[PDB]
Structure 1
Amino acid sequence: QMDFIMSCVGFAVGLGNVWRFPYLCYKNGGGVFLIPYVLIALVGGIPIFFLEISLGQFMKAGSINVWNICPLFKGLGYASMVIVFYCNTYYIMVLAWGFYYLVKSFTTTLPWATCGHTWNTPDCVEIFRHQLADRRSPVIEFWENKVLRLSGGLEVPGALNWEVTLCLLACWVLVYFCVWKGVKSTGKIVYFTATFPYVVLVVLLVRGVLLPGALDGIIYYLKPDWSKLGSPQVWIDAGTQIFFSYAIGLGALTALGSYNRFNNNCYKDAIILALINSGTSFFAGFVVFSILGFMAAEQGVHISKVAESGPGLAFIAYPRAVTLMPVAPLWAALFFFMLLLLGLDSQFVGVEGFITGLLDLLPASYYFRFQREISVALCCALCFVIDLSMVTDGGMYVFQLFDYYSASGTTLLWQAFWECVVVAWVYGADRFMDDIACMIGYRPCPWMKWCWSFFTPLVCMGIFIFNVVYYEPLVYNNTYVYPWWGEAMGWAFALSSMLCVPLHLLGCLLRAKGTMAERWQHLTQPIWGLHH
């Protein structure tokens, strides 16, 4: 089938693989991040991936309705919207920044190739020699003083950055327009958009290999520092990175499953999609970390102190690589066009899911002449208004609050744990596996059943508990200690997402009559579709 290609340009391959995984690996240390990544991909990632797709095919519906199997826990679906909504709030910003770089690519030279553009600190040198710890590369200067214009901290937002604001306006109007038409990338264009990224990456990787000091970068990427394994930071980062790269809990995998036919091979679908996501993430890791090793061997700073540890690494490693290509501006335009394509396809599927969920929720009395178009326009405008607080000088910090705490962190752990609990335990993991076998013919290995029943909830609960017990305040670029109210806002996002389940459960219990026993029994009775 081509369902893999359909997801490859959808809720799967994108910035979460090319932009996020590299900087998460860098922030947690190179080698030590892979082991929890692999373990949770085997135990948490692939199993919930297959769970979402299988449940989507089974229920023949997406977003909220799929939880008709356990209507009492239908609030989980609600949470998905909030989570994906938060993605739509900040994901686009990466695109915006990427778009800005693309706008700056179409020049006879490159703005970040050198620093003589009157937006750089005096401590910037284009070439490095044998003062010490007092020099910054032009690429990081451009990233932190033209795209971001980074302020002192979250306490002082500063002056709104107009250039990135027009770039974000262009991204949002483009999303509005080409989501209004609903292109869905057609059927033959997808082919190109599924093979254009890798080509570029491959080229970059080749260049990345042929550099002095790239071997050090690759070794640091692969060989792990076992001391960091005890830290819960790497475990929470790996679990959330997998649950984000797969769009687990965002209510897009479920719709993608619903699009498939009933007599489908969803088990191999999930396995192949997961392998593609992990392979693209590993390839992007190679591309980023070879460049990081090159900059470590060039500047002289340690490999862990080369570039930004926050979300800026993808904008400090990838552009740098481009500057080493023969015809730099053409390759900058090509790579950032690739990045724009990935981010755009992901944003299209996410916004489509959110809008369809909202439209299904709203009653008939709320119908408008252009209800779909007006709803999409209002969502885009509201998200742009929220992002107005993230393009400001002290805007990058807000982005981190929207990245670490919102649609990631303990939010995705909570969502995945409750998904596994409601399906494997409340609904019956054995019965669900029997239903999947009826759908698909054969029987998957019992490893999936063990992952659903015990392994995945246990791993998620353990990561959450060991992070909370040894809680460390979120620090951006290992320099800025977030104040109490910054963590308060981050936890406000997190609890806004994670309250959807318990509040909805409580409201359903109040609405039901009699004692809690028969109320739970009646509200957990599945509501099957017509075809079942």
Structure 2
Amino acid sequence: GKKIDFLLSVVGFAVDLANVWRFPYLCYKNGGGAFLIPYTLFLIIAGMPLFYMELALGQYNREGAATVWKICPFFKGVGYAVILIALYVGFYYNVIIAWSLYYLFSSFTLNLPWTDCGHTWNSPNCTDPKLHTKYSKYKFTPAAEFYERGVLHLHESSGIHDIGLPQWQLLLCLMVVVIVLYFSLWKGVVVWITATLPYFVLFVLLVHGVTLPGASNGINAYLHIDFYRLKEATVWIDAATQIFFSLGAGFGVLIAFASYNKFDNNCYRDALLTSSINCITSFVSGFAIFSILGYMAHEHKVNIEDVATEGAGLVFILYPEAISTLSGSTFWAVVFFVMLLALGLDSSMGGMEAVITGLADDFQVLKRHRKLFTFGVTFSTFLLALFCITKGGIYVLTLLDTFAAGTSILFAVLMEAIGVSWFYGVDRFSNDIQQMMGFRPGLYWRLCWKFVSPAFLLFVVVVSIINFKPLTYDDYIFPPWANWVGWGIALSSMVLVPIYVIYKFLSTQGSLWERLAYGITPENEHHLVAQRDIRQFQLQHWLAI
């Protein structure tokens, strides 16, 4: 019983809606396997040590994302930045769950709406294989037609400048999701359903998609590595962003979750198991998705590179198509979309609780009024997600998914790593981990924390800034001002670090060096500053690993 509970806890903690929904289309856009090589490399090098670092910080300090920086006051700006990034992500992370709920509601019938066209939302150009040529993305399939016309109603929007009005069905779905999240978060701080359904679905998908008419060529395309594409840095940027998405680092979720953990909990084992399960699940998901889309390529008589969209919604075009060919399609559709709802709800409560804990640890008034604060956060998310359910809401969702995270999250995580490792001290961090868990981290962990991970993060951030491709959605090109809007969205969270550094420097009293010492010394050691004994002002601190 207890062993099963531990296994379920680890397995559920190792899964996210990202691994199931976002990895599919990032791997399909970025190549096949030319995405897994950067994915695995970054996973190990940065994601494992940084996941471990965030868990250890949260566990030892017993503070949220913002207040954990009492160890180094100057990085409370980084804390605020990660909180803001988590706030930004929710606006559309909760609209994907509205899509999932709409699909689940549609799944309750003996004739799935995505099996063939002939409905009201169907265009005259629909082609039913049972009943293009170039580089387009084949938006004339019954499943794609359903997703884009009976769900999104995208055909009524000419672009992000003509988004239109909110859809009254996705509106109700979002209302339901928002109410559920609030009522699940309004009291304080699911594993059985979440830790089992994703793996059952993934296993059945593998077993069924392997034996399909055209899965062989899809798998062949999956297992071909184009090293012409590792030489572009788009795959590397995507891999880094997806790693920090699936693992949960950079949003303040890990610190907030770990602040409630036991003081003697083992974070090294947690990081190891989470990373291993994440890698295995990502590889298997890529395999299954590529088999499914190779099958579609065979069925629709179109090239593997044009069967499906390369943006959000690839899963909502793929998984229904695979379900339609199973026996008892209604049962499997219901099961799969219930799994999607469970995963999305778990991740949404995780992010919202990260935000709430980070903001309530800072202010005691918010802590004393969890109900009102939770209602405010939930209502703000509901409104700024209503912004994304419009007719042209897929364009807004693409803009957000591209800009809210990405360079901003990479910068925030790099700043966190730099702060801890260099200013607070990797030696001090190792001593704290030893005190918590009884063993000092190995040399590999310290090197990754101090030198390797910050360097790779800096390289990725610099490349993502200097090598920026204008935003697009399949065959639609965003207007120039949309790119400025997205860059402003990213900068709104990136700039919070220097702003808080300047504010802290100005507010603090004393001379320049006194202000610096008060800014880099832990709040509980501020009585050393009067004694002129600061470790950071000695070469030994900066020359110690």
User: For residue 110 of structure 1, what is the amino acid of its counterpart?
Assistant: L
Which whole-Å deviations, capped at 9, do the CAs of 1:433-466 have from their partners, x for residues lacking one? Answer: 2322332223333121111111111111111222
1:154–1:398 contact (8 Å) kept in structure 2: yes
CA distance in 1, matches of 2:70, 2:367: 25
TM-score, normalised via structure 2 length:
0.90
Matches for 1:508-519 after TM superposition, within 5 Å: 508-519=504-515
Secondary structure (helix, strand or coil) at the match of 1:229 reads coil
Q: CA deviation at 1:493?
A: 1.4
- Which of 143, 148, 155 is the aligned partner of 1:144? 148
Secondary structure (helix, strand or coil) at the match of 1:472 reads coil
User: For residue 437 of structure 1, what is the amino acid of its counterpart?
Assistant: Q
1:292–1:317 contact (8 Å) kept in structure 2: yes
The answer on 1:411 being equivalent to 2:408 is yes
User: For residue 28 of structure 1, what is the amino acid of its counterpart?
Assistant: N
Matches for 1:212-231 after TM superposition, within 5 Å: 212-231=213-232
Structure 1 partner of 2:453: 456
CA distance in 2, matches of 1:379, 1:4: 33
- Which of 373, 376, 401 is the aligned partner of 1:375? 373
Q: Which sections of structure 1, spanning at least 5 residues, go unmatched?
A: none
Structure 2 partner of 1:522: 518
| Sequence identity (%) | 45
> Which range is displaced more, 408-417 or 294-303?
294-303
Matches for 1:100-111 after TM superposition, within 5 Å: 100-111=102-113
CA distance in 1, matches of 2:523, 2:274: 30
CA distance in 2, matches of 1:21, 1:376: 30
Matches for 1:27-426 after TM superposition, within 5 Å: 27-127=29-129, 136-150=140-154, 151-182=157-188, 185=190, 190-364=191-365, 371-406=369-404, 408-426=405-423
CA distance in 1, matches of 2:303, 2:182: 44
Structure 1 partner of 2:486: 490
Which whole-Å deviations, capped at 9, do the CAs of 1:501-528 have from their partners, x for residues lacking one? Answer: 1111110011123443331212211135
Q: CA deviation at 1:181?
A: 4.4
1:125–1:135 contact (8 Å) kept in structure 2: no
Structure 2 partner of 1:467: 464
CA distance in 1, matches of 2:274, 2:285: 16
CA distance in 1, matches of 2:160, 2:392: 5
> Which range is displaced more, 285-294 or 90-99?
285-294
CA distance in 1, matches of 2:258, 2:6: 9
CA distance in 2, matches of 1:308, 1:416: 30
CA distance in 2, matches of 1:208, 1:46: 31
1:128–1:299 contact (8 Å) kept in structure 2: no
> Which range is displaced more, 509-518 or 452-461?
509-518
Secondary structure (helix, strand or coil) at the match of 1:305 reads coil
Q: CA deviation at 1:339?
A: 0.5
1:4–1:269 contact (8 Å) kept in structure 2: no
CA distance in 1, matches of 2:476, 2:29: 14
2:257–2:354 contact (8 Å) kept in structure 1: no
Q: Which sections of structure 2, spanning at least 5 residues, go unmatched?
A: 526-545
Which whole-Å deviations, capped at 9, do the CAs of 1:127-168 have from their partners, x for residues lacking one? Answer: 169x76788210011111121111221111124211111111
- Which of 421, 432, 436 is the aligned partner of 1:435? 432
Which whole-Å deviations, capped at 9, do the CAs of 1:250-271 have from their partners, x for residues lacking one? Answer: 1110122222222232111111
TM-score, normalised via structure 1 length:
0.92
User: For residue 49 of structure 1, what is the amino acid of its counterpart?
Assistant: F
> Which range is displaced more, 234-243 or 421-430?
421-430
> Are the structure 2 counterparts of residues 69 and 125 from structure 1 closer, same or farther at C-alpha, using a change threshold of 3 Å?
same
Secondary structure (helix, strand or coil) at the match of 2:308 reads coil
> Are the structure 2 counterparts of residues 278 and 528 from structure 1 closer, same or farther at C-alpha, using a change threshold of 3 Å?
farther
CA distance in 1, matches of 2:206, 2:524: 49
> Are the structure 2 counterparts of residues 135 and 251 from structure 1 closer, same or farther at C-alpha, using a change threshold of 3 Å?
closer
2:178–2:382 contact (8 Å) kept in structure 1: yes
1:7–1:256 contact (8 Å) kept in structure 2: no
2:85–2:251 contact (8 Å) kept in structure 1: yes
CA distance in 2, matches of 1:394, 1:163: 15
> Are the structure 2 counterparts of residues 8 and 504 from structure 1 closer, same or farther at C-alpha, using a change threshold of 3 Å?
farther
Q: CA deviation at 1:492?
A: 1.7
> Are the structure 2 counterparts of residues 520 and 218 from structure 1 closer, same or farther at C-alpha, using a change threshold of 3 Å?
farther
CA distance in 2, matches of 1:199, 1:338: 10
1:90–1:387 contact (8 Å) kept in structure 2: yes
> Are the structure 2 counterparts of residues 399 and 181 from structure 1 closer, same or farther at C-alpha, using a change threshold of 3 Å?
same
Q: CA deviation at 1:470?
A: 2.5
Number of aligned positions between the proteins: 517
1:72–1:520 contact (8 Å) kept in structure 2: no
